[PDB]
């Protein structure tokens with residue numbers, strides 16, 4: 001009983017884009033020997049869009065872990081969600097929210113819009129410009145952010161304010177950063193997988209160095225870790241391990 | 247060339263619910279004598295959901311004005327949008343946004359979530375709890391709000407701060423209030439309609455008294471105004487005016 005578990009962006013697909021039909025075809029071939037799963041920081045809709053038409057993703061993969069595994073489809077079935085408010089408690093969560101509102105009230109940007117704080121399943125996403133900006137506005141903010149280190153300074157202030165309180169931050173996006181509970185990196189999905197009797201869980205990712213969003217799940221003793229540089233590399237690695245004779 | 251223009255909630259449908267098939271059938275009958283249109287403060291998706299399946303609404307009505315007419319479908323065709331930032335300018339808009347962020351940072355509630363500021367086409371929607379709350383959380387906030395007058399006090403502070411700057415406020419919702427430019431009440435749709443050569447525009451609404459969201463469009467010299475108390479009343483009124491012989 002083996003599971004191959006894959007990061008999505010840069011591991012199975014070009015970052016944030018549709019999977020190559022050849023890679024998709026190989027994954028289904030691999031599926032004749034092992035179970036296959038994906039884990040990504042993006043939401044289900046995004047991952048679904050990258051990995052097939054409609055909701056095909058939950059049929060094509062045995063596991064679909066969205067938002068680092070806080071959202072789980074297991075053999076086509078959506079499991080219940082643990083909420084961030086349940087984990088953090090309402091007081092810490094609101095302390096965080098109000099600190100962010102207060103900080104952003106004092107930031108002056110070329111443009112602001114709406115959805116400065118997006119309450120997701122696995123994180124709070126914080127966007128100084130607001131998520132409802134256009135593409136050109138998005139690019140404008142990104143360029144300013146590089147010059148003024150707006151998100152970086154905001155994250156420094158947050159880390160210090162909440163020191164010791166179990167919060168983690170990532171600047172994965174362009175107009176935002178994510179705030180998530182400690183352990184709600186990709187390792188989150190491993191606790192559910194622990195219960196599914198796999199002899200071996202192979203994890204493949206393209207950000208397996210320190211600071212990368214695959215590091216923790218890669219390095220976790222529950223996984224056999226594989227560092228890849230592209231979807232073609234991932235396929236080669238899988239052929240080598242699971243189709244040695246071929 | 248006559249247009250009948252209808253508010254949606256409480257005028258054609260029970261508030262925020264699907265239209266009665268009998269009322270829907272009458273509107274299509276009325277359409278044999280006049281053009282028919284709807285104008286609502288809700289977004290297109292909501293109005294579409296109330297008035298048919300899928301996008302049937304834009305086929306069933308000659309005009310669909312969503313968000314008070316800042317979003318317009320004319321004979322099945324979506325017209326271009328004028329944006330709030332274009333109208334207000336980026337400086338006033340950000341002054342507004344930062345005042346709201348600052349104010350809300352200091353509010354302590356039982357629960358907070360996300361989407362405190364929703365940037366729509368025709369307004370900014372401001373929600374102290376956050377739009378991404380659950381139904382029970384929504385009811386919890388509503389009950390607290392009645393006790394503490396949270397939205398009312400927030401709106402007082404905003405009106406005073408932006409006195410003379412052309413902003414209007416409404417507490418139409420339960421967990422939020424809307425901020426919109428002066429004249430972006432339902433009258434907004436009348437400027438486009440002015441260009442469409444109607445001899446007469448009859449407007450029907452159920453909130454036509456001062457303070458009601460139909461008052462301005464009702465009282466506008468460009469419309470023949472009709473006050474109704476229900477969709478059955480609206481139908482009766484229409485039969486009386488446009489099918490006098492029947």
Ligand SMILES: O=P(O)(O)O[C@H]1O[C@H](CO)[C@@H](O)[C@H](O)[C@@H]1O
Nearest residue numbers: 041042125172173174175176178
């Ligand atoms: O700020 P950006 O560039 O839109 O990226 C953020 O939001 C994306 C969409 O929800 C996420 O997919 C990203 O992971 C990130 O949380």
Ligand SMILES: O=P(O)(O)O[C@H]1O[C@H](CO)[C@@H](O)[C@H](O)[C@@H]1O
Nearest residue numbers: 287288371418419420421422424
């Ligand atoms: O705060 P509430 O109760 O969700 O209502 C507000 O949002 C609704 C949905 O966008 C709108 O339909 C309402 O008109 C209002 O702007």
Ligand SMILES: [Mg+2]
Nearest residue numbers: 007009010206
């Ligand atoms: Mg990756």
Ligand SMILES: [Mg+2]
Nearest residue numbers: 218219220223
């Ligand atoms: Mg490992």
Ligand SMILES: [Mg+2]
Nearest residue numbers: 253255256452
């Ligand atoms: Mg009404």
Ligand SMILES: [Mg+2]
Nearest residue numbers: 464465466469
């Ligand atoms: Mg009038």
